[PDB]
Copies of this chain bind each other. A is one copy, B any other.
Amino acid sequence: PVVDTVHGKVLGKFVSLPVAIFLGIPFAKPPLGPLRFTPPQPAEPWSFVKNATSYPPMCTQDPKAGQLLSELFTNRKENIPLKLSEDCLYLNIYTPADLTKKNRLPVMVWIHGGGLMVGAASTYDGLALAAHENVVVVTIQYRLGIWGFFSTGDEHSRGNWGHLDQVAALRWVQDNIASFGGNPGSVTIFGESAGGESVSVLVLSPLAKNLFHRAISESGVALTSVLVKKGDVKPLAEQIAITAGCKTTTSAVMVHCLRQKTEEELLETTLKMKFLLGTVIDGMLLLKTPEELQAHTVPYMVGINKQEFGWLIPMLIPEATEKYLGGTDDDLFLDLIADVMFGVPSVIVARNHRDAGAPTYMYEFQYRPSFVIGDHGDELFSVFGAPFLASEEEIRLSKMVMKFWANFARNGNPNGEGLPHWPEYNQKEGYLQIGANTQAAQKLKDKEVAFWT
């Protein structure tokens, strides 16, 4: 299959579950040399046909931690080994459309997670979802760690370099997606963990206006303080510069020095830092804090998993400790951490969104995939049809979820034939409990919110 984009022709391959898969398409200019720590640039056009049949590179991050996460979230039988590089602003496309005719299938752009430190788009295979629910799946990449989030707190390096790629990727879709059978007028963004935090931010950013029409934050929102550095970040910048062997005489000086370091050097700095940097109020992408901003009204689904701090994350005061551990002398602490990190934040968000006047849907995933219940990221295997790349029970669960996510992708409403009714998160605070028994329920984490608030 050969599609014709704005920057040139790209050659893909057919895969039958047939679908046309285009791996590694550049949506920006390689952020190398002096382009580092700067907004993404449009991509230079190419003559002839661009062969897009091999996976693009993860983006520079810890190679061990990244390969481990890829291995734990991937919905492919065999995990794929990625290369590391600063040249990583690529996206993958999975289209079920029959390119030999016009097609306006809805579009679902996925934003991977990884604490804004690790991850890759190639981890998630959208062959299943595309084929099953007849939508165009796009997995994008953005800069991570130092490379995509270094900030000085001033005009010499505002920050959010990573969030700007996400926007640039979204804009590449508006201008080119129709050539793959997708309707640029019906675009949905969704991601989990740091990926949900990103979906949440783009919904709050003026720059992302008109680039999408629906959103899905899976286990993660903007209020999840961990990923949003509020206050003076200058001190974090100065430490990073020092650890890397730079002077901190001034901001401008710190950035110039860092632009000369080699990728390998900046990775050793990253390693020394022993993380595991983040979204900041830069003045361009975010003008005020997520809180102040909650003081685009597009359909927004927000969900969490039963046990967020059950195993995956942990593995990789008195009043509170008491409030969760008092009633038993004999997991409750893991529920504490869970509620503070996703539980409470998610609902307070869903409520504000609901209150600003836009459609809102909540869900609580609860199921132990075959590939602790409702652990971090467990919903991922259902959304991406892992059971097709499994007890007959699981196969069905995936089918149900994909249909929900897909329906929403086209109507801004998850409901449809053969699917338990999913109430809208209105005043009745009606949400969905997804699992072996998917039934409606009400007032999710209500009590805790009150407590923590």
A interface residue numbers (CB < 8 A to B) = 8, 30, 32-34, 44-48, 50, 57, 83-87, 154-156, 158, 247, 249-250, 252-253, 256, 259, 282-284, 287
Which among B57, B253, B282, B284 is the interface contact of A249 at CB below 8 angstroms?
Answer: B57
Q: How far is the CA of A259 from the CA of B34 in the complex (A)?
A: 12
Give 9 A-B contacts (CB < 8 Å), ordered by A residue.
A32-B252, A33-B256, A33-B259, A46-B283, A47-B282, A85-B247, A86-B253, A87-B249, A87-B252
Residues on the B chain within 8 Å of A46, using CB: 154-155, 283
| Chain B residues with CB under 8 A of A247 | 85
A48 touching B85 in the complex, CB below 8 Å, given contacts A32-B256, A252-B30, A256-B30: no
Which residue of chain B has its CB nearest to the CB of A234?
B51
Q: Copy number in this complex?
A: 3
Across the interface, A84 reaches (CB within 8 A) one of B50, B158, B249, namely B249
A256 to B33, CA, bound (A): 7
Q: Write the chain B residue with the least CB distance to A284.
A: B47
Chain B residue nearest to A8 in the complex (CB): B155
A284 to B8, CA, bound (A): 13
A47 CA to B285 CA, complexed, in Å: 11
Alpha-carbon separation in the docked complex, A287 to B1 (Å): 22
Which 5 residue pairs spanning A and B have beta carbons closest together? A47-B283, A46-B155, A30-B252, A32-B256, A85-B249
Tell me, in angstroms, the Cα distance from A46 to B153 when the chains sit together: 10
Given contacts A283-B48, A284-B47, contact A87 B253 (CB under 8 A): yes
- Give A46 Cβ to nearest chain B Cβ, in Å: 4
A57-B249, A86-B253, A87-B250 provided; 13 other pairs, C-beta below 8 A?
A30-B156, A32-B252, A33-B256, A34-B34, A46-B155, A47-B155, A47-B282, A47-B284, A57-B250, A85-B249, A85-B253, A87-B252, A87-B253
Cα A256 to Cα B156 with chains together (Å):
23
In the bound complex, CA of A45 to CA of B86 (Å): 27
How far apart are the CA atoms of A155 and B30 in the complex, in Å? 12
Instruction: Report Cα–Cα, A287/B48, bound state, in Å.
Output: 9
B contact residues around A154 at 8 Å (CB): 46, 50
Q: How far is the CB of A200 from chain B (nearest CB, A)?
A: 21
A85: chain B residues at CB < 8 Å are 247, 249-250, 253
Contact flag A249-B83 (CB < 8 Å), given A32-B256, A256-B32: yes
A92 to chain B, nearest CB (A): 15
A253 CB contacts on chain B under 8 angstroms: 30, 32, 85-87
A30 to chain B, nearest CB (A): 4
Q: Which B residue sits closest to A286, measured CB to CB?
A: B47
How far apart are the CA atoms of A33 and B250 in the complex, in Å? 15
Query: Within 8 Å CB of A32, what residues of B?
Result: 252-253, 256
Task: Tell me which residues across on chain B come within 8 A of A44, comparing CB atoms.
Answer: 155-156
Chain B residue numbers with a CB within 8 Å of A259 are: 33
